[PDB]
Design a protein around this nucleic acid. Structure first.
Lengths: 197, 106, 170, 69, 127
RNA sequence: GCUCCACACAGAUGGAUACGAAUAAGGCGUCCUUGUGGCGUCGCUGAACCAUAGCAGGCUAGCAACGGUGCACUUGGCGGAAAGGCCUUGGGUGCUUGCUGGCGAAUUGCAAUGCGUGGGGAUAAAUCAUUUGUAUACGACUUAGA
RNA sequence: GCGUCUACUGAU
RNA sequence: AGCGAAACCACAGCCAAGGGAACGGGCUUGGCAGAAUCAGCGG
RNA sequence: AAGCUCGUAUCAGUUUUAUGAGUAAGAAUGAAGAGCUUUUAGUGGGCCAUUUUUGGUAAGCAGAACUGGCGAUGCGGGAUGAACCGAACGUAGAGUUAAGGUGCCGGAAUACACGCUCAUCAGAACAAAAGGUGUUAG
RNA sequence: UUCACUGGGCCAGCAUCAGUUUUGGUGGCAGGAUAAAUCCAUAGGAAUGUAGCUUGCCUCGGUAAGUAUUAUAGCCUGUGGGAAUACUGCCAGCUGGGACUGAGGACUGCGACGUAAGUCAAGGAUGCUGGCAUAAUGGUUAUAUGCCGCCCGUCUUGAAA
């Protein structure tokens, strides 16, 4: 129904989020993933790191650059995983993949726009409590991502520059809530209550 | 005034197919709000429609319309099989399609 | 679903010996055919009478007198695995015998990887008094006014998206 | 919603009532008579006139398979 | 602070033929399966798994192993049905059911009343 | 691009509807005891909120109103991550279905959805050409001249 | 770890 | 400056794994990378 | 291929019985298309698996009795294939299956219930005798 | 020449039909231990011991040890009373919805209804209507979309080479 769906990266499972997003993306639905640096992956951090340096040994013999490229950006690496879940070799797959956009954090104008989450892909709803998990934050930095510091630095400003907006909205809604509470008990108002409204 | 849409809007996923062979004669359509095959039973037999902006002005209006009918439910995900007197060009995978309420039976 | 059927054995009566040995036993199975097959298999090992010479007289179902009463069923089981056969004893807390045996089979498949082929039911009986439940994990539920929470509840939704990020409080 | 119909005669609107081969006067008179007869019934239920005059349309999130008619 | 399964706990069935009907826990069988009784609600006495039933935040006194008659007597004495109505659960369920049953004319009346209420609220604001 | 001459025209159908954050805890109000606090309450899915009535949505009269809102200016801040949007301040300009009336829908007849080109006038400069070496097997590149 | 017809090595 | 062949040519080429006698070059799974275009390690 | 009397008990990769260390059925089942004379093209091969073996050593193996597929064999599936599973074939419209599948590439439920396991590359023909103060149950 | 009626071919919508097939609602039957459940009564047993009472104790005159089998809750065993209901199977039961086929071509027959007359869903679609001659509609060509497709014939091939 929504022309564009913004999925919050925080708390999501990379494997489950990519699988569900791929099918929706292939059905003409535009999806914009945000906070890619906060995606969570099951298993111990060392375990996740282990299956990242494995493919360096097999890049290519004749010419290393003529083979797989070691990408470290949290946004693109998640896209790379989703790339393997779609028939990117076909023309339709390429067009569908163009719909998906991934950015670290929440860059504008998406900051002022609502975002959604995927209940069937939340790490907090599938991983057993107490089990080790990979946050993908230090992992990206541990493999050469040098933008984690900047992301953390400028994420606080966005939160600071957004908490006050919510306070102002809540203060504004108080007047509306009081008006509704005092406006109730009227003949017109009671009619809506009887009809389920 | 604000909204005139009477047709139900859905999405065309892909033709009925298998691991290797595909059958373009049976289209699969997704309908908003249909979660289970039981709900899809109401949408069976309805006239399906597709709208796209053509280039040549055949009759003043560039828009062109293709017609079809629902046949039966497909899968537990609420997908419904669709058939058209003119098969879709297969380039509309993931596009939006119009499903009319008529013929009504309620 | 599992079911309980009672079968008897009166292998064809030789001259001057009608109704021999009245071989009565109880069988747990889903349908009548499986019950009869398991009865024949058990007879072929407990004694030497073959199915060809045997004859099934009647098969009657046996329900539970109180299918709404929680009971601590005692279960004796003889089964086989990659090693030689060995008897086993277990206690299961269930309302009905059929449910108890179903859970017994599921547990045997879980931990012992056994199945219907390798599982033989010896006897099932109810525990009439407390403190007779040897298994601690079963006696645990017998404590006075046992109350426990269910933290971290799971939930499912038809929609593939949600704007709330609901908590698992429960 | 069901309005009373016994108060308006409809026996004249037979199959032959419609034919072709700039508005016929008798049809206009019959329509006016029918409207004036049904106005009395319509005036009973409040907001019924406005409800009829309002064109029906679907809204976002509507589920026709769940809507009750 | 969590809802605890115990004798006399009132529960709501989420799935099955008895969905939307209240029930009371008679005795816990194990961590996964418990026994419930809902004779006032009409659900027959039968065991059910915790997955198919959601625990409500209300409770009432009930002896362990109480039969159907005793369960009904305790249900009547505690008036848990009246407590359910005042709970947000019953209000939400009634609101959801009523909206789905609204006819087209009733829906139009709802729209008109909502417009009138919005106009009144706007008039009563920014005064 | 200033300008003249001359011709050519991957899927819109109400609203991406903004706090942070745990998931063995988290919001709203009360209430200062402003502390890791007391009290009522929320979830248990968005099955929600806003919005939606008028020939593809007209003309016209009255009441309450002075509220709601499309339109350009206007006092100004924020937004630098892919800033490209928010409003308020003031009148003006339309509507108001919040309420009460008058004018007409037909014949469409029982559905076939109903912004660039090829030629000039003025401006901008870069290769061509010469020179140069700081470059140089040969391309390429770097200096200088109305 | 350092000790003991696929390809471009200079190019448009 | 100008003239002016021949050998050969079913068609021909970005790679890793499977492919049975392994021939992989046209089958499958993944990763590559630029119309056009000099020049070669002592392959 | 041509001719005959035939139509049946001609018979049958089937089964049972009075009766072996098949005899007969005024038996069970099924095909109405069985024999006799004259001759007409083509045919002297193996591979894979099995009931037998000639014996097991790290290991050579040739000789050879038997039944199924390929031979001459499509199509669905095991993503990838001769030795696998179902299935053998007139062009077609309508619905249900088998193998094989249901997160995506892939058309199909991220279905229900029991517990099991965090592998420093778990999991989706051989070293398999032991070790763990690893875990779940007797 | 006054007129009145009427008209070829394309595909469709509508009502009811015959065949195939898919999925709902509902009623009536036979069996289980004449279902077992649940409920009522009856004689007994017990604690994971209901109340009362006793014994000592702080957050208060109630906190864990007793007598205690229903008391200021209830549970189980056997018996009697009575219905209900899951499951299975049946109805030559009723009632909708979703998809395709229209094939044959004046009566010879098998059947039902109806007093007869006649009718019918009874050995294959009947009737109304929509749109059109600058038509309706159809074909061809070059890309595009999803899938499939290893280059031809021969020859030693067990075959593959």
């Amino acid at each position: 129904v929504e022309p564009v769906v913004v999925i919050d990266g925080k708390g999501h499972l990379v494997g489950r989020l990519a699988s569900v997003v791929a099918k929706q993306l292939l059905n003409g639905q535009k999806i914009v993933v945000v906070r890619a640096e906060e995606l969570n992956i099951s298993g111990e951090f060392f375990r996740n790191k282990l299956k990242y340096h494995d493919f360096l040994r097999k890049a290519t013999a004749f010419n290393k650059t003529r083979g797989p490229f070691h990408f470290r950006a949290p946004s693109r690496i998640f896209y790379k995983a989703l790339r393997g879940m779609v028939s990117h070799k076909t023309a339709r797959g390429k067009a569908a993949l163009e719909r998906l956009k991934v950015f670290e954090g929440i860059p504008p104008p998406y900051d002022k726009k609502k975002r959604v989450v995927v209940p069937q892909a939340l790490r907090v709803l599938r991983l057993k409590p107490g089990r080790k998990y990979t946050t993908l934050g230090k992992l990206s930095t541990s493999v050469g991502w040098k933008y984690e510091d900047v992301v953390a630095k400028l994420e606080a400003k966005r939160k600071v520059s957004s908490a006050e907006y919510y306070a102002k909205k809540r203060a504004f809604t108080k007047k509306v809530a009081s008006a509704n509470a005092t406006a109730a008990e009227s003949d017109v108002a009671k009619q809506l209550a009887a009809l389920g409204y | 005034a604000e909204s005139h849409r009477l047709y139900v809007k859905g999405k065309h996923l892909s033709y009925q197919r298998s691991k290797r062979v595909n059958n373009p004669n049976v289209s699969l359509i997704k309908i908003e709000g249909v979660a289970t095959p039981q709900d899809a039973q109401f949408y069976l037999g309805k006239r399906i429609a597709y709208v796209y902006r053509a280039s040549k002005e055949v009759r003043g209006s560039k828009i062109r319309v293709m017609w079809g009918k629902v046949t039966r439910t497909h899968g537990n995900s609420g997908v419904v099989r669709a058939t058209f007197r003119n098969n879709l060009p297969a380039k509309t995978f993931g596009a939006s399609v119009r499903i009319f309420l008529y013929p009504s039976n309620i | 679903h599992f079911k309980e059927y009672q079968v008897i054995g009166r292998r064809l009566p030789t001259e001057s010996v009608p109704e021999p040995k009245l071989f009565r036993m109880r069988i747990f199975a889903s349908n009548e055919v499986i019950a009869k097959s398991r009865y024949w298999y058990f007879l072929q090992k407990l004694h030497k009478v073959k199915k060809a010479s045997g004859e099934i007289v009647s098969i009657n179902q046996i329900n539970e007198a109180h299918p709404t009463k929680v009971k601590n069923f005692g279960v004796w089981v003889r089964y086989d695995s990659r090693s030689g056969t060995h008897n086993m004893y277990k206690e299961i807390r269930d309302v009905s015998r059929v449910a108890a045996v179903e859970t017994l089979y599921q547990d045997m498949a879980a931990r012992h990887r056994a199945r219907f082929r390798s599982i033989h039911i010896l006897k099932v009986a109810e525990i009439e008094k407390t403190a007779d439940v040897k298994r601690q994990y079963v006696k645990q539920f017998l404590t006075k006014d046992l109350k426990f929470p269910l933290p971290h509840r799971v939930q499912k939704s038809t929609k593939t998206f949600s704007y709330k990020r609901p908590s698992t409080f429960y | 919603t069901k309005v009373s119909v016994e108060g308006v005669n409809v026996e004249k609107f037979n199959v032959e009532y419609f034919a072709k081969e700039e508005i016929k006067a008798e049809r206009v008179e019959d329509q006016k008579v029918v409207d004036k007869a049904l106005i009395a019934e319509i005036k009973k239920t409040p907001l019924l006139k406005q409800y009829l005059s309002a064109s029906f349309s679907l809204k976002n999130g509507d589920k026709p398979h769940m809507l009750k008619f | 602070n969590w809802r605890l399964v115990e004798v006399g706990r009132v529960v709501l069935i989420k799935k099955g033929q008895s969905a939307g009907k209240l029930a009371a826990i008679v005795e816990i069988i194990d961590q996964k399966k418990v026994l419930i009784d809902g004779p006032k609600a009409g659900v027959p006495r039968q065991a059910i798994n915790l997955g198919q039933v959601v625990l409500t935040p209300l409770t009432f006194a009930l002896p362990r192993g109480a039969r159907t008659a005793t369960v009904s007597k305790k249900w009547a004495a505690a008036a848990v049905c009246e407590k359910w109505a005042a709970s947000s659960w019953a209000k939400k369920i009634a609101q959801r059911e009523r909206r789905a049953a609204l006819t087209d004319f009733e829906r139009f009346q709802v729209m008109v009343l909502r417009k009138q209420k919005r106009y009144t609220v706007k008039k009563a604001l920014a005064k």
